């Protein structure tokens, strides 16, 4: 018990060094792909700098809430907040010295009044256990106002309710706006001891011992008297649909009152999840690796209730079939790159539900998700990056996906214009003109890649006319390639290059042709035709040389999303993430190995500041998981993984059937970062990639490593 | 055909004279107690001065929307707006000369482009017919942004959609805030001719021939080409729950495309409704009377869909039983006085659903409605005036009401404190202190009356302890009766009379102890113990004298809700409405008859400015209906109607069974306003009231009238 789970350190990514963006992870309890993230908030109102609610540099806890995002650069959720107290207090100091976390478990001693808080979860319930000093009164404060910063996104509470049903049960809801336009969060809560007195309020309006209150700024205080020394256990279930659903969620998943038993089931559940990859390496490597793997598995989030009901993207209540689960929290601009490829390896059964969930947005909203939060699109970032995810699953043969319905959704999302996707402009110009559509160069590149995916899906279904159309569109990166400067640059609607152009200059999220990066970084974004890109650059040697400049040029111009620098390579944001693997394509695999190894060893660590930037729903972590094993999905829809440099001594992927993909290394020391040779299933392996089918068949792959570059693949 | 419906003039109450508040009625098509109010908007953004959307003093139509309130002093709804055009225009001039309206039908010639618009409805569908000139293009503009004034109530569109399903079908929705906190309006629309081209937009973002758009500021234009000379018919169904429900609403109620047939069914439906009272009088009287009766029957509004589903007050989707309908639009501060009593006479089957609907708010929200709009409370005005309505129905024996569940709702709404109802303050002080709860005197009086109702209901169910409690509370008006001045006046929490006090001074809706009136007007609000009030005033002669001062004192101090003045009596707002009947209680029935007759003949007319103030969901109209027949529910929960002065020569109420209550007059001329004697079922009638049971038994009542006061009841 705890062989693997003891390696996860939930505090990795919860802080930042001295400036530089936090990982924005949280240390509190959750379950795999769960609905509940039960965690302390170290802010009264979480914002972009502490978007999960927890910041390791802070020393005050303002309550325990039940929902949040992991690693995002904008805050939302933070719903249903409990705080223990003996004297109506709403905050407490704490120290990291008297605080612990592990998969499914969080504990902290609240110092102001010496109350011990422990947290665990099921898929849809949060479970609390609070120990008050003997001789002191036990109270719980319920805060329904506490949320992400109300000065952002037009965020306000439209309406809410707290309703005491009996001496051990409370229910309510909040309807709230924000980064997601409209969310409804219903709850059902029970206590292990009877409520003796209580107070409800809405702002300055206070009602003593009153069974219900409605309003926009609601707070409850429940008083249990002297319980010395019995702990108070609280159970809280949520739903996007109704209080009835939430109650039913509790009846099915959390009927009992054995706290330690919930803790043990969460740990067991996490041991099975993390056990999908058995690794061998140093103790620090296993900590960093299993923590990263944990970060990939805490979302997408369960949205449907145990009865299958969910709020759909048309704001109506719908129901999935009995063997299906509706998911949300799709940070797709990030997660299409590595996280979704990882789920095809470890979570094929869940991938079918992720895809079905994406398709429901098309069905009820008109196009697939761009960035999805609480069952609805918020259009964050760029592209239509459901498309690679859905394409990749289908091409790989992930079972249970209706391919014709999936194609309809992908096709219609690629021809029906919508914000940041003016498709008539796209097909008329063969690029996005900056004066018509901003973030034009980044969109042109990323959308071109989305279009390649559509083409591959059309080819699979024998839709020849569609293949031509979308293949031609996949080639529109060519229309922005400048033949003198050899960068992709912005043009206007007259077909003229905008001048002046500085390839070091950062753009934001509009008002500039690049999205949270510069032209140096976006140059590499032709993942579906690296051969064409190399040719345009002047051939393999010229392409190698440009990569060398990229990795060594230290000019600081600036966007705060960019950090974790290797020259102009910025590991802290995701446009760079595929680039270190590109030396393979240029005939210098040793340089990929050199740079990958440098990033793994130098831009990740096992402290609070352990990621180079925002984790972004586990994308930064997924990069580590992939790269540490020794390969990466450069084109996340072609079913190939490009070999880098294996960090760990061994890795074993557990697959369906009783199959295993066994990765092994022959090395003398940790200096042995260069690949001398590779074998797959006993035959010498002559390519710089392994296929998805090679992995899912089961088999074994051996790397002979060495301290010096060989001529392998060179 | 049209014997009765030809008397209704929908333009009565749609204007105002030269200042003074409009009736705020609308002339467009609707069905009895319907979901759809299909009517032109003469404003871009309706506000308090034109809250239904139509103002008779205006000459431009900005579209035809499908929802509104009748006669309210605040605007909401105004959802789903169509406008015909031949050249993308969004407004048109019109004249009353080329415009018509009658129950279930509205027509207007739009002058700018010579397009004829006709409108009718079913319970849940709006039906349009537009005739374009031969040789001109047919287009429809769909405006999803058009609404009540967005500068009030924090009103904004959270999200919306327009989605073209095929060449003849469009669906969508809007989610919007306002006077009601959150409303979701889903629609399904069909055209009689195929859409040839189209445009959708969200603000400046325009998408040509695109099947769907999402956003907060959406507009569609649909182009049908040259249809000369076939009219374009449009059908539009709504739902509070889903597009599927809306479609199903159309399939059940409006499958066909015969416009004239829809018109005829609406007229037939209205003929049965208005036929519940057959009246004889002058032609002008029948116009004023049947129009008033129409105004009482256009709300409460159907909210549940044909499958029984509705949005409940916890914002969840629920379903009523197959023989039930969920209603909303309960303007209770107004309608508890006369409109709800009228529904007990004419609409007992609907009253059961109204009561069930009120109880659903208690079940899902925690207390009964105060003022209900689109299935939720907005707390407008004062009191808990569901209570008289629910009490009155139960005491009268309206069938199908669960009395124990109803009592639970009434009781819990009377002891669970909530905004404007601090019940612990109430029971500690025996009044509302002005420094703790504003509008204190008006609330004290009205809440005292609500409490009498609870007491009567407790007595009916043999709950003796409850009877005492609420009877004692019904007497709290005594604690604000000033023994020197003989007015009800405000006190502070030390029990001290606030000074100075001016009984002419108007209050608003907070910051003053009276609600949209002065102390002169609120003095009469002890409807449940007029005997006690007369005694406190110094006896019947003193009480008579105070009424005389009230009806003759012309001092102008001012609140714009108060208008239609007879001295300090202000017919234009509803605190005054019972007062002319109080001379009966004082031993001077002839003075009631004098003043009632004066109000009927002088403060109502058959022009656009035909009401003395806001109709308030038919309360002003209900006053006319009752008073013209010759009696009024002074205490709207004791099942007595106080005799005034019958205006009409005859009236016949059609009741269940084949029963009739036949009211007849013996008179020589219209000067004969004074009652000489009364007979009921052939026996001489010695009381100044008739009972509800006397009416519902069927029978006949004869008034001998004369030009001069008799000593009848004197
Ligand atoms: O969190 C949402 C998005 C991310 O998808 C993306 O990685 C981007 O870097 C970013 N900065 C702030 C917010 N975001
Ligand atoms: O329309 C809602 C309420 C009415 O219930 C009431 O008659 C009052 O006079 C009033 N003035 C403006 C709005 N209102
Ligand atoms: Ca990022
Ligand atoms: Ca009024």
DSSP secondary structure string, B85-106? ESSS---EE--GGGEEEETTEE
Residue A634 tokens, joined: 């450069």
DSSP H or E run through B351: helix B348-365
Reduce the DSSP state of residue A344 to 3 states and report it.
Answer: helix
Label residue A587 left, alpha or beta by phi (over 0 means left) and psi (-120 to 50 means alpha).
Answer: left
Rounded (5°) CA angle B121-B123-B127:
25
CA-wise closest residue to A669 among A629, A707, A703, A638: A707
What is the C-alpha to C-alpha distance for residues A267 and A279, in angstroms, rounded to an integer? 19
* DSSP for residue A378: -
CA distance readout (Å), B614 to A324, B28, B73, B151: 54, 18, 6, 22
Residue B182 tokens, joined: 């959150």
Neighbours of B192 (CB within 10 A): 18
Reduce the DSSP state of residue B29 to 3 states and report it.
Answer: strand
Contact B146, B63 (CB under 8 A): yes
Contact A581, A644 (CB under 8 A): yes
Residue B387 tokens, joined: 């209570």
Helix ranges restricted to H, B202-258: 243-253
Count of positions (residues) in chain B: 714
Rounded (5°) CA angle A224-A230-A236:
60
Cis ω on the peptide bond leading into residue A370 (within 30° of 0)? no
| Pairing of the two strands B699-706 and B660-666 | parallel
Any ligand 2 atom below 6 A from CB of B615: no
* DSSP for residue B230: P
What is the C-alpha to C-alpha distance for residues B13 and A395, in angstroms, rounded to an integer? 67
What is the C-alpha to C-alpha distance for residues B107 and B671, in angstroms, rounded to an integer? 39
* DSSP for residue B491: B
Contact A342, A33 (CB under 8 A): no
What is the C-alpha to C-alpha distance for residues B203 and B62, in angstroms, rounded to an integer? 18
CA-wise closest residue to B532 among B464, B570, B589, B478: B478
Q: How far is CA A619 from the centre of its chain?
A: 6
End-to-end Cα spacing for chain B: 46
Contact A443, A434 (CB under 8 A): no
CA-wise closest residue to A196 among A266, A138, A129: A138
Residue B119 tokens, joined: 């409108």
Label residue B90 left, alpha or beta by phi (over 0 means left) and psi (-120 to 50 means alpha).
Answer: alpha
Residue B388 tokens, joined: 């008289």
What is the C-alpha to C-alpha distance for residues A377 and A313, in angstroms, rounded to an integer? 8
Range 311-340 of A in CB contact (< 8 A) with B:
314-317
Range 211-270 of A in CB contact (< 8 A) with B:
211-215, 241-244
| Pairing of the two strands A169-176 and A218-226 | unpaired
CA distance readout (Å), A351 to A342, A344, A348, A387, A397: 10, 7, 5, 14, 11
Distance to chain B for A445, nearest Cα, Å: 23
What is the C-alpha to C-alpha distance for residues B606 and A362, in angstroms, rounded to an integer? 54
What is the C-alpha to C-alpha distance for residues A127 and B686, in angstroms, rounded to an integer? 72
Contact B507, B515 (CB under 8 A): yes
Residue A549 tokens, joined: 């400049």
| Pairing of the two strands B277-280 and B137-143 | unpaired
Contact B463, B415 (CB under 8 A): no
DSSP string spanning A599-666?
A: HHHHS--SSTT-SSS--TTTHHHHHHHHHHHTEE-SSTTTTEEEE----SSEEEEE-SSS-EEEEEEE
Backbone angles phi and psi of B265, in degrees to 5 = -65, -35
* DSSP for residue B392: H
In the structure, how many helices (H) and strands (E) does chain A have?
17, 36
Backbone angles phi and psi of A112, in degrees to 5 = -50, -40
CA-wise closest residue to B573 among B71, B34, B4: B71
Reduce the DSSP state of residue A453 to 3 states and report it.
Answer: helix
Residue closest via CA to ligand 1's atom 3 equals A73
Q: How far is CA A15 from the centre of its chain?
A: 17
What is the C-alpha to C-alpha distance for residues A55 and A14, in angstroms, rounded to an integer? 6
Neighbours of A653 (CB within 10 A): 18
Gapped junctions in chain B, after residues (C–N > 2.5 Å): 557
CB contact under 8 A, A212 and B366: yes
> Which residues have C-beta within 8 Å of that of residue B200, sequence separation ≥ 6?
B162, B164, B206, B207, B210, B212, B213, B218, B219, B220
Nearest CB among A156, A163, A416 relative to B210 is that of: A416
Residue B184 tokens, joined: 């979701």
What is the C-alpha to C-alpha distance for residues B266 and B289, in angstroms, rounded to an integer? 20
Place of tokens 């445009």: B199
In the structure, how many helices (H) and strands (E) does chain B have?
17, 36
What is the C-alpha to C-alpha distance for residues A561 and A596, in angstroms, rounded to an integer? 21
Residue closest via CA to ligand 1's atom 14 equals A73
Any ligand 2 atom below 6 A from CB of B110: no
Q: Is B184 on the interface with A (CB under 8 A)?
A: yes
- Tally of CA atoms within 13 A in the half-sphere of A212 that contains its CB: 23
CA-wise closest residue to B132 among B86, B75, B70: B86
Q: Which residue of A has its CA nearest to B415?
A: A210
Give strand pairing partners of B82.
B64, B142
What is the C-alpha to C-alpha distance for residues A194 and A83, in angstroms, rounded to an integer? 17
Contact B13, B615 (CB under 8 A): yes
- Give resolution in angstroms: 2.4
Q: Any residues with Cβ below 6 Å from ligand 1, and which?
A: A 72-74, 331, 333-334, 380-381, 516, 561, 573-574, 614, 616
The sign one gets for the Cα dihedral B281, B285, B289, B290 is positive
Backbone angles phi and psi of A247, in degrees to 5 = -55, -50
> Which residues have C-beta within 8 Å of that of residue B126, sequence separation ≥ 6?
B29, B36, B38, B64, B66, B119, B235, B236, B237
Residue B89 tokens, joined: 């225009």
* DSSP for residue A32: T
DSSP string spanning A407-438?
A: HHHHHHHHHS-BTTB-HHHHHHHSS--TTTSS
CA-wise closest residue to A628 among A268, A292, A228, A130: A292
Q: Which residue of B has its CA nearest to A160?
A: B314
Contact A200, A166 (CB under 8 A): no
Any ligand 2 atom below 6 A from CB of B576: no
What is the C-alpha to C-alpha distance for residues B377 and B329, in angstroms, rounded to an integer? 10
| Pairing of the two strands B205-208 and B137-143 | unpaired
Residue A346 tokens, joined: 């470890």
Distance to chain B for A207, nearest Cα, Å: 7
Backbone angles phi and psi of A509, in degrees to 5 = -125, 50
Mutate to test the interface with B, among A172, A241, A315 (most CBs of B within 10 A): A315
Residue B266 tokens, joined: 């609406």
Contact B26, B52 (CB under 8 A): yes
Count of positions (residues) in chain A: 714
**Strands of the sheet with B699-706, listed across from one edge:** B277-280, B650-654, B660-666, B699-706, B674-680, B683-684
Residue B315 tokens, joined: 């914002």
Yes or no: domain A5-275 corresponds to CATH 1.20.120.80: no
Residue B261 tokens, joined: 């047939």
Contact B51, B39 (CB under 8 A): no
Question: B245-271 burial by CB neighbour count: b if 16+ within 10 A, else e?
Answer: bbbbbbebbbeeeebeebbebbbebbb
Label residue A639 left, alpha or beta by phi (over 0 means left) and psi (-120 to 50 means alpha).
Answer: left
Q: Is B58 on the interface with A (CB under 8 A)?
A: no
Task: Assign 3-state DSSP to chain A and report helix, strand, coil percentages, each to 5.
Answer: 30, 25, 45
**Strands of the sheet with A125-131, listed across from one edge:** A99-102, A105-110, A115-121, A125-131, A232-239, A183-191, A169-176, A157-166, A212-215
Neighbours of A657 (CB within 10 A): 8
Residue B75 tokens, joined: 């605007």
Q: What's the A381 CA to ligand 1 centre distance in angstroms?
A: 7
Cis ω on the peptide bond leading into residue A300 (within 30° of 0)? yes
Range 409-468 of A in CB contact (< 8 A) with B:
412, 416-419, 424
Q: Which residue of B has its CA nearest to A425?
A: B207
| Pairing of the two strands B699-706 and B674-680 | antiparallel
Contact A12, A288 (CB under 8 A): yes
Question: B344-381 burial by CB neighbour count: b if 16+ within 10 A, else e?
Answer: bbbbbebbbbbbbbbbbbbbbbbbbbbbbbbbbbbebb
Neighbours of A416 (CB within 10 A): 17
CA-wise closest residue to A13 among A62, A64, A52: A52
The minimum-distance atom of ligand 2 relative to the CA of B619 is 7
Residue A654 tokens, joined: 């557990």
What is the C-alpha to C-alpha distance for residues A131 and A135, in angstroms, rounded to an integer? 12
CA-wise closest residue to B147 among B374, B375, B376: B374
Give strand pairing partners of A175.
A159, A184
What is the C-alpha to C-alpha distance for residues A641 and A437, in angstroms, rounded to an integer? 33
Rounded (5°) CA angle B335-B339-B341:
110
Task: Assign 3-state DSSP to chain B and report helix, strand, coil percentages, each to 5.
Answer: 30, 25, 45
Mutate to test the interface with A, among B310, B315, B363, B364 (most CBs of A within 10 A): B315
Mutate to test the interface with B, among A154, A159, A245 (most CBs of B within 10 A): A159
What is the C-alpha to C-alpha distance for residues B45 and A511, in angstroms, rounded to an integer? 34
What is the C-alpha to C-alpha distance for residues B123 and B266, in angstroms, rounded to an integer? 9
């Amino acid at each position: 018990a705890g062989e693997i789970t003891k390696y996860v350190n939930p505090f990795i990514g919860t802080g930042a060094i001295d400036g530089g963006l936090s990982g924005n992870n949280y240390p509190g309890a959750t379950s795999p792909f769960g609905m509940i993230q039960l965690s302390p908030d170290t802010s009264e109102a979480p914002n972009w700098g502490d978007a999960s609610g927890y910041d390791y540099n802070r020393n005050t806890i303002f309550g325990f809430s039940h929902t949040r995002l992991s690693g995002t650069g904008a805050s939302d959720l933070i719903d249903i907040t409990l705080m223990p107290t003996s004297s109506g207090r709403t905050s407490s100091a704490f120290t990291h010295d008297e605080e612990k976390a592990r998969p499914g478990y969080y504990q902290v001693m609240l110092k102001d009044e010496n109350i011990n808080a422990e947290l665990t979860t099921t898929q849809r319930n949060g479970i609390h256990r609070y120990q008050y000093p003997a001789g002191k009164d036990a109270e719980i404060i319920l805060d329904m106002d506490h949320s992400a910063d109300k000065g952002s996104w037009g965020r306000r509470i439209i309406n809410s309710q707290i309703r005491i049903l009996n001496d051990h049960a409370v229910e309510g809801y909040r309807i709230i706006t924000g980064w997601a336009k409209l969310r409804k969060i219903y709850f059902y809560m029970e206590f292990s001891s009877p409520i003796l007195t209580s107070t409800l309020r809405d702002g300055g309006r206070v009602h003593e011992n009153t069974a219900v209150i409605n309003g926009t700024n609601l707070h409850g205080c429940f008083r249990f008297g002297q319980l010395n020394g019995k702990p108070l256990t609280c159970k809280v279930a949520l739903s996007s649909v109704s209080m009835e659903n939430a109650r039913q969620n509790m009846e099915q998943e959390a009927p009992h009152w054995d706290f330690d038993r919930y803790v043990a089931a969460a740990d067991a559940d996490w041991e099975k999840q993390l056990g999908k990859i058995e690794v061998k390496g140093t103790e620090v490597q296993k900590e960093i690796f299993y923590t990263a793997l944990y970060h990939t598995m805490i979302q997408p989030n369960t949205m449907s209730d145990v009865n299958g009901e969910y709020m759909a993207a048309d704001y109506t209540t719908r129901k999935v079939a009995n063997n299906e689960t509706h998911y949300t929290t799709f940070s797709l601009w990030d997660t299409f790159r590595a996280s979704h490829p990882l789920y095809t390896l470890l979570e094929p059964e869940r991938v079918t539900d992720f895809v079905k969930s994406m398709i429901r947005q098309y069905e009820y909203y008109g196009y697939l998700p761009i960035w999805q939060l609480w069952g609805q699109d918020n259009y964050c970032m760029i592209g239509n990056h459901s498309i690679p995810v859905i394409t990749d699953a289908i091409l790989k043969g992930i079972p249970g996906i209706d391919m014709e319905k999936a194609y309809e959704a992908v096709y219609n999302s690629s021809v029906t214009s919508h914000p940041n996707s003016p498709f008539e402009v796209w097909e008329k110009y063969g690029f996005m003109p900056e004066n018509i559509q901003t973030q034009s160069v980044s969109i042109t590149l990323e959308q071109a890649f989305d279009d390649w995916c559509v083409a591959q899906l059309a080819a699979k279904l024998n839709k020849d006319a569609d293949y031509q159309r979308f293949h031609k569109r996949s080639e529109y990166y060519r229309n922005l390639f400048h033949p003198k400067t050899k960068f992709f640059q912005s043009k206007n609607d007259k077909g003229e290059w905008i001048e002046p152009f500085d390839p070091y200059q950062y753009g934001g999220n509009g008002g500039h042709p690049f999205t949270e990066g510069n032209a140096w970084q976006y140059f590499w974004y032709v993942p579906h035709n690296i051969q064409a890109l190399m040719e345009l650059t002047g051939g393999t040697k010229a392409f190698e040389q440009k990569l060398d400049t990229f990795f060594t040029s230290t000019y600081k111009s600036m966007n705060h999303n960019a950090s974790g620098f290797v020259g102009q390579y910025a590991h802290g944001n995701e446009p760079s993430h595929h680039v270190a693997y590109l030396y393979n394509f240029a005939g210098q695999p040793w340089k990929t190995q050199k740079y990958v190894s440098h990033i793994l060893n130098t831009l990740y660590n096992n402290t609070s500041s352990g990621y180079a930037g925002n984790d972004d729903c586990g994308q930064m972590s997924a990069w580590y998981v992939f790269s540490a094993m020794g390969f990466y999905p450069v084109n996340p829809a072609d079913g190939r993984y490009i070999i880098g440099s294996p960090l760990l001594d061994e890795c074993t992927l557990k697959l369906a059937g009783n199959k295993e993909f066994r990765i092994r290394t022959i090395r003398k020391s940790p200096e042995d970062i260069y690949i001398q040779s590779v074998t797959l299933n006993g035959k010498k392996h002559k390519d710089f990639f392994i296929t998805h089918q090679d992995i899912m068949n089961g088999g074994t792959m051996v790397f002979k490593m060495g301290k010096k570059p060989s001529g392998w693949g060179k």
